[PDB]
Amino acid sequence: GDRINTVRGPITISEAGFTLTHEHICGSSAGFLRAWPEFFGSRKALAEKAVRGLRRARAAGVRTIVDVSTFDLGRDVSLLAEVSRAADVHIVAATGLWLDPPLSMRLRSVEELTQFFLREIQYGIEDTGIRAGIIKVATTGKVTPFQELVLRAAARASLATGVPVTTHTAASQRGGEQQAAILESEGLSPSRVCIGHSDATDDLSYLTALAARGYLIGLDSIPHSASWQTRALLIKALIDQGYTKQILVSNDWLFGISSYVTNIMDVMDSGNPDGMAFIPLRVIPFLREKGIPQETLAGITVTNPARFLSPTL
């Protein structure tokens, strides 16, 4: 009712504060970080870079991030816990499945996947006792039969535990509509779902209609455009349509990445030196200078994630 699971344990809704709802410490693959830490220089080097990054973000106001790295994205909650403590920033961990499931996941039934998700939420991830506070799902534009199983399992897990669902989409294909239909067929409330990567489109009609059904709209990759201004104005556009309370904002940034061709991390960093501090240091002043009240911005960056993450129903 009033508590969410983080990598350091349970915390009250009040303690969450300014929350970036879609971020990554490391974008990788299952087992990869521990098998090949050298790829990131070293595990310590990666940990240190994250801590410095998170500390700057904290200096700029951020108090909580939701790491939406799944099993198949190389989620290492021990790394999350280590960097969360050193930086003193809350990190919410995720279960669910992204776009790279191995055979041992691809060949599972919806009932089996439901059990895996429940495990990571109710018991803990691996042997850590760290519990997931959100369920991530990724689909291609047209939802594949396996991705539909993952969607349904996520809905059933969410209905059993109250933790929310966040999605990866192709907004240019308007992927969120196919997902929503499947999720609702399972009896899941739109208020428990964030349709992610929605800032990668100019289709306001698509965005508003989803918001009007109660869905959280993930405008979560603003600096990837580094234009980034156009993405930010979608936040304004949705406010002006009256859907302030359905907006979630993030950077979708990373401190390490192996699930892409080599050297991309340095290109990203030089493209966006602010890292996860891009939202508080760049997007928020931009929105102020456009006439959005400070109180509406606080509602979006604090109150909305609070409402979204609190286990419900």
Place this chain on the structure above:
Amino acid sequence: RINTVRGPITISEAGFTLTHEHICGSSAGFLRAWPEFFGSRKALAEKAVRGLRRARAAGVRTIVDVSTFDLGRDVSLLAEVSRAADVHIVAATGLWLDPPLSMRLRSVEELTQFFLREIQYGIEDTGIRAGIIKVATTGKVTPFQELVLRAAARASLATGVPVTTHTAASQRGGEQQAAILESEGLSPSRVCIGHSDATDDLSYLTALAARGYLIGLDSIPHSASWQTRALLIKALIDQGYTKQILVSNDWLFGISSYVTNIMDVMDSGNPDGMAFIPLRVIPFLREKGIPQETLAGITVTNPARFLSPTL
């Protein structure tokens, strides 16, 4: 000296060695994330220890676990079951058929570094070093599979550690593998072409053997006619290529990389497990006139010569 999950052993300690086996056929990260799939980690461990003791009591002294990173290799489990069962286990590097994005997008130079790491330094943070390099291909060999082939050759050439392959024998896939590996300067004597018992094309096997490749007749119980597959062993013996033969079960004690409950299907079909080769195939070969010295050469001498790091 051969690297095992318990440390280095001399080639004489190896003894009766099964050169293609698995403790568990899974996926990277899977065993630690979802141990309940196998009942529990403890349940999986205990089954494997019983099975390895069964094989030990049948003469086996060493198995080669050719589970790679993407087959969900957990060398801490291997070390645990090896100690409990007093059976040597050789661990593998390389890549099987389910590489994740973080592997699929790597260059050959990068893959070479990863394989070298697991051979020279250790696997994960355990200090356990790989003693063999596994590689799997399909069809005519995909572009990425070529990269793994070449990275494996380069790792082998720098360390002396052998290369063992997964192949579609029905497609004569060993020929393309051989071509690529030889282009890298790798000697065929450092290479086992595996799953070669899944064909009837004897001339395919003979031609590879004649070039110096080890022939992995490693899936005999996966037929159980297994008697027909066993006759391939005698066929190569009769052609004077006893030196080129490796035999194994390719068995597992837990499987997650397939449909649920496939493990139970497999166990009821082959209740002997990894003891299938010594309890069924070896006596069957004696009946057909194969002398004990020849059988000892296949099960002891050949794997020792294969696994011993050689330049």
